[PDB]
Design a protein around this ligand. Structure first.
Ligand SMILES: [Mg+2]
Ligand SMILES: [Mg+2]
Ligand SMILES: [Mg+2]
Ligand SMILES: [Mg+2]
Ligand SMILES: [Mg+2]
Ligand SMILES: [Mg+2]
Ligand SMILES: [Mg+2]
Ligand SMILES: [Mg+2]
Ligand SMILES: [Mg+2]
Ligand SMILES: [Mg+2]
Ligand SMILES: [Mg+2]
Ligand SMILES: [Mg+2]
Ligand SMILES: [Mg+2]
Ligand SMILES: [Mg+2]
Ligand SMILES: [Mg+2]
Ligand SMILES: [Mg+2]
Ligand SMILES: [Mg+2]
Ligand SMILES: [Mg+2]
Ligand SMILES: [Mg+2]
Ligand SMILES: [Mg+2]
Ligand SMILES: [Mg+2]
Ligand SMILES: [Mg+2]
Ligand SMILES: [Mg+2]
Ligand SMILES: [Mg+2]
Ligand SMILES: [Mg+2]
Lengths: 104, 159, 49, 176, 187
RNA sequence: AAGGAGUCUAACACGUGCGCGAGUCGGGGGCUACGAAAGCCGCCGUGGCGCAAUGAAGGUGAAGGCCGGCGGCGCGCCGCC
RNA sequence: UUCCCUCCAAAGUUUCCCUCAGGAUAGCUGGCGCUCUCCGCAGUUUUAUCCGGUAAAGCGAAUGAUUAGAGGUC
RNA sequence: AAUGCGAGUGCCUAGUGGGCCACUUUUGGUAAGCAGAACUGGCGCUGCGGGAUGAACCGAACGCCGGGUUAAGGCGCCCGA
RNA sequence: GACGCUACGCCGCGACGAGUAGGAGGGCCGCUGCGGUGAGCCUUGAAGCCUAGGGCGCGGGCCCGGGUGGAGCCGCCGCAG
RNA sequence: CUCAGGGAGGACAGAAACCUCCCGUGGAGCAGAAGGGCAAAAGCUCGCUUGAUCUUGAUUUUCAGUACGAAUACAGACCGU
RNA sequence: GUCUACGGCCAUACCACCCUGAACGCGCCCGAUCUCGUCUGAUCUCGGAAGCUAAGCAGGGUCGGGCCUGGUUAGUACUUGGAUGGGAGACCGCCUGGGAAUACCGGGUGCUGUAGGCUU
């Protein structure tokens, strides 16, 4: 009573019925597996980002006000070109009006 | 059946090249890997600590964690119905900067420079990579001599 | 806009070639049908269209 | 190659890609026998890939024309130089034919090799075809027609069209 | 023949409500007319949500309604609910709210009407804003049901906080071999 | 020719329909031909399940921030109204 | 192992089991949907960039096998 | 970059877990319609035209019909040509 | 000043149609009994049975005609096996 | 510090004891089976030692992507050199 | 042009023999009281400056060996896909694309980073 030992004959056809899909690419991947010392210090940086908030708006509102003084310192043939202009429903409206007023 | 050993069939895969044995060079030590860098994996048999497994040899991934002597890499692995995102800690001698993204970055800076250019000149410059087109119609000069007549040679039993 | 113009067209549902095929299983330079027949695709086009 | 119908006789000129090393390659002309120009270009690339180190992707077809018979109204002796494969071994030959056109003589040569040596057209490799004077011929099957006062009858005229009078009364006559 | 695959030819989605209740089936007729006779996508979303099962329209709490209508810009608007507006009793102040829902519970209705707002039905909403203008579509937490704690990666697998199916919870109910580093292993 | 084989009860999961909804449920009990049905009880909601988890257990048990005044440490922190 | 029609449609493979005529598990299947649309994805190619030690080849290159002469001093 | 295509996602889930054949690669064996692998396609689950016959070969996959044309095969007669 | 719209209805464009194990849907397919309903059928002939009769439906099946027979039977909306 | 091996020398000393010079890419050795790796070393000889200690998590290998075993990067301590 | 200290790529840099080295340097060299270590101041460590490029080192040479890079080998060997191609087979030819490696024959024989010198 000997039986078949091992094969992968139909396996490559079974894999492609629902497809071989890559893992779900998301922005902001998890920080799980990152080393504990740098992960601990990053949490301390996030804990005190709110400390210099009133100094941060004093720079970003300064930049937004300086944006005003930055931006206000600066502040195939002629036949087929004519016929495609007349055939325009909006641009050739007065040209079609001229043609309709050409036969009276 | 085969064994489930960790280094089975790695005889030529983890061997050093011919006349490239001995002391490992130090430029593979004193180069900098940061998070998000694209890194290909090539196992070296001189150092034995932090060796990647044989299924990651010749693969390419992205660094997510950097330690004192090693980096952590997210490598795609083909497993039996699907692809998994593996996180492997590989010591720095098995690690090389991949040059596949380098051409893309040099093209990004070229495209940004060529888009800053020709905005004040009003023209339109091609930024897509077109494939190899059919060649344009040209004249071949047979100046002087006629083309040489080629004929098949007779057989010689040189066995 | 060749990509858009060609993708707008449905793939052409052509009949069987009148007169007959030469040999379906072999290349055109072997006296068959498969592969690149450079100027002679029109002869198939009139008998198949 | 499949020797379909009668062959046409093509002059095919090709060259290599112009490179920074070889800025102008020499042009190579060949004398191809093929049913059409699509087969003729493929046989040109086969022969030139056998002789020179030049491939279809590394080269181009500069010219491919059908060059005709300069005199298809006189009968000519054609000597053809062969290189063929047998079931065990490959051999060279020289054969002689009588024809009005060079391509007709080579067409007759392909049927002759297939008839006598069971040599298919892919094993047959024509290497030189030459118009031969009647005093330079060698085969007695061709030299027997070099007679100014040639004379023979048609001795046993077998009756063709055996099915239009299909049920007939008189028995057929073969003497004419 | 063609080498196409007929596995995904039939999309599963709902064309009609499975329920046979005739008051819902008249609102389905109304918003089916409105979705094809207007270009407003609000009527399409309302008509599609009227088809859905009871688990696909979970109830809103009044407190979640207060916070989702307290946001800036969306004042004097009609909150449109396809499910049920239930009362949430851990809130003390109720402002006035213009409400459209399929069902409003009896104690939430009293609190809304005592606050001074209005409670509409969907025919009243179709008469008031046929294209659903000045409305805020809201829906309940769909993963709020207890059934979703047992879903996902299986328990007894590394990094899987999936609730197992136990006949009861306690000291000696699935807490020994796959859970302890002492007895066997821990995932 | 006739009979002849995934049924019934209990338990669980998931989906679906209905009612009520942070509640819900009288199934046990009681009141008042079909009817052994239907109706009603609310200080009959006991009780079940849900609303709180975690620990073996003793047990414990689900945002904070700013400012002023005071005390201490040497401008920040801690404690205190 | 008892009526009809319609639609979709397999597997004899992985791992574990006193497992080898059987189960559990993953895979293949079906049904129920839902979230969006009215960027993403691909049993494919092109262009870059890495990986290999098979086919071939080599033994006047290491290891192992192996045939013949020739020139040499002690 | 080209070409093409609407995708993503969550529950519940039957049957199966004896396989076999063919081009190429390939192990044991003198060999086997033998035993054992890799890849792809089939048969199993599938009718149809051809190979006289026929699980697997060649062509081509199937709702019920009319007209036309083909594939692989053929065109003395059986037997259409 | 035609018809329409059993909206669970009606109508219009395309594409497609193999199937074992298996899964799902639709049955104005069929059997028996119950709650409603056909001012239902019936000794001027019910059920059942027979039929070289007329038909409908892809099909499961069904409706009429003739004969036989002598007392009960069926359609629709739900329910149950 | 340099090994295996070889050459030329030196009383007994010879094929082979010990000393010295030169060549020596590893032809040695690293406990074992084989493969990979290694020369101011991972080999040999010395000096000091107990990182073969305590404690969380993460990862790889087998894999169902579960365990056990084995392994890799860290982090918190106390240490050795 | 060139050297020294520390290097990068690790023979185009290695190996054998010969020739030439101005100046600074690098060395050989002279010693053992101190630091230090040995059977032995030979090595290592220390204190020096009489002599010398002899050697190390640098540059160059050899129809040099090696190494590196090309041609030939050769569109050969091999190989993706195809045929109701051949052959009794063994195997081979053709279509469609890709394409090696010896022997043999040429060319070359370290580039360079930082800091500091000499050639004033
Ligand atoms: Mg088996
Ligand atoms: Mg015809
Ligand atoms: Mg075929
Ligand atoms: Mg069809
Ligand atoms: Mg199907
Ligand atoms: Mg389906
Ligand atoms: Mg019966
Ligand atoms: Mg439920
Ligand atoms: Mg059996
Ligand atoms: Mg191998
Ligand atoms: Mg070989
Ligand atoms: Mg077999
Ligand atoms: Mg199938
Ligand atoms: Mg078939
Ligand atoms: Mg036969
Ligand atoms: Mg027909
Ligand atoms: Mg026949
Ligand atoms: Mg079907
Ligand atoms: Mg009968
Ligand atoms: Mg050391
Ligand atoms: Mg001395
Ligand atoms: Mg010197
Ligand atoms: Mg000298
Ligand atoms: Mg040389
Ligand atoms: Mg320098």
């Amino acid at each position: 009573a000997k039986s078949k030992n091992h094969t992968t004959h139909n396996q490559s056809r079974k894999w492609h019925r629902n497809g071989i899909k890559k893992p779900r690419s998301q922005r902001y991947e998890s920080l799980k597996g990152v080393d504990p010392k740098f992960l601990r210090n990053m949490r301390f940086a996030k804990k005190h980002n709110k400390k210099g908030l009133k100094k941060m708006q004093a720079n970003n509102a300064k930049a937004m006000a300086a944006r005003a003084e930055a931006i206000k310192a600066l502040v195939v043939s002629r036949k087929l070109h004519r016929l495609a202009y007349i055939a325009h429903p909006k641009l050739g409206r007065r040209a079609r009006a001229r043609i309709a007023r050409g036969l009276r | 059946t085969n064994t489930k050993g960790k280094r089975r069939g790695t005889r030529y895969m983890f061997s050093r090249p011919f006349r490239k044995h001995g002391v490992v060079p130090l430029a593979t030590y004193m180069r900098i890997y940061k998070k998000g860098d694209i890194v290909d994996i090539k196992g070296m048999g001189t150092v034995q600590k932090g060796m990647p497994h044989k299924c990651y040899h010749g693969k390419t991934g992205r660094v997510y964690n950097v330690t004192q002597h090693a980096v952590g890499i997210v490598v795609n692995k083909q497993v039996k119905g699907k692809i998994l995102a593996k996180r492997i800690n590989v010591r720095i001698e098995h690690i090389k900067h991949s040059k596949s993204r380098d051409s893309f970055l040099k093209r990004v800076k070229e495209n940004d420079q060529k888009k800053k250019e020709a905005k004040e000149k009003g023209t339109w410059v091609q930024l897509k990579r077109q494939p190899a087109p059919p060649r344009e119609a040209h004249f071949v000069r047979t100046n002087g001599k006629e083309p040489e007549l080629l004929e098949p040679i007779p057989y010689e039993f040189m066995a | 806009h060749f990509k858009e113009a060609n993708n707008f067209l449905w793939p052409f549902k052509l009949s069987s070639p009148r007169g007959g095929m030469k040999k379906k299983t072999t290349h055109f330079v072997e006296g068959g049908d498969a592969g690149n027949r450079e100027d002679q695709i029109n002869r198939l086009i009139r008998r198949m269209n | 190659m499949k020797a379909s119908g009668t062959l046409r006789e093509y002059k095919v000129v090709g060259r290599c890609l112009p490179t920074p090393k070889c800025r102008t390659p020499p042009l190579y002309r060949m004398r191809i026998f093929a049913p059409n120009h699509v087969v003729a270009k493929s046989r040109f690339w086969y022969f030139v890939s056998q002789l020179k180190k030049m491939k279809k992707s590394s080269g181009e077809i500069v010219y491919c024309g059908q060059v005709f018979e300069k005199s298809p109204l006189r009968v000519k002796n054609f000597g053809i130089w062969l290189r063929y494969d047998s079931r065990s071994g490959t051999h060279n030959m020289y054969r002689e034919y009588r024809d009005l056109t060079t391509a007709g003589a080579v067409t007759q040569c392909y049927r002759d090799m297939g008839a006598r040596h069971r040599a298919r057209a892919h094993s047959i490799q024509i290497m030189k075809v030459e118009e031969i004077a009647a005093s330079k011929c060698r085969r007695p099957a061709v030299k027997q027609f070099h007679d100014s006062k040639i004379k023979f009858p048609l001795p046993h005229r077998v009756l063709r069209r055996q099915h239009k009078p299909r049920f007939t009364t008189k028995r057929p006559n073969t003497f004419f | 023949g063609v080498d196409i695959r007929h596995n995904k030819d039939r999309k599963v989605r709902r064309k009609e409500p499975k329920s046979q209740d005739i008051y819902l089936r008249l609102l389905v007729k109304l918003y089916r007319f409105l979705a094809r006779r207007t270009n407003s996508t609000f009527n399409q979303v309302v008509l599609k949500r009227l088809f859905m099962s009871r688990t696909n329209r979970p109830p809103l709490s009044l407190s979640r309604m207060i916070r989702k209508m307290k946001l800036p810009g969306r004042e004097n608007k009609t909150a449109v609910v396809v499910g049920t507006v239930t009362d949430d009793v851990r809130v003390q102040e109720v402002p006035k709210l213009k409400v459209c829902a399929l069902r409003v519970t009896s104690r939430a209705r009293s609190r809304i009407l005592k606050a001074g707002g209005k409670i509409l039905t969907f025919d009243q909403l179709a008469l008031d804003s046929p294209k659903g203008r000045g409305t805020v579509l809201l829906s309940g937490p769909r993963k709020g049901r207890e059934v979703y704690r047992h879903f996902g990666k299986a328990p007894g697998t590394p990094h899987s906080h999936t609730k197992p199916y136990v006949r009861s919870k306690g000291r000696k109910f699935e807490r020994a071999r796959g859970r302890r580093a002492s007895r066997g292993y821990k995932n």
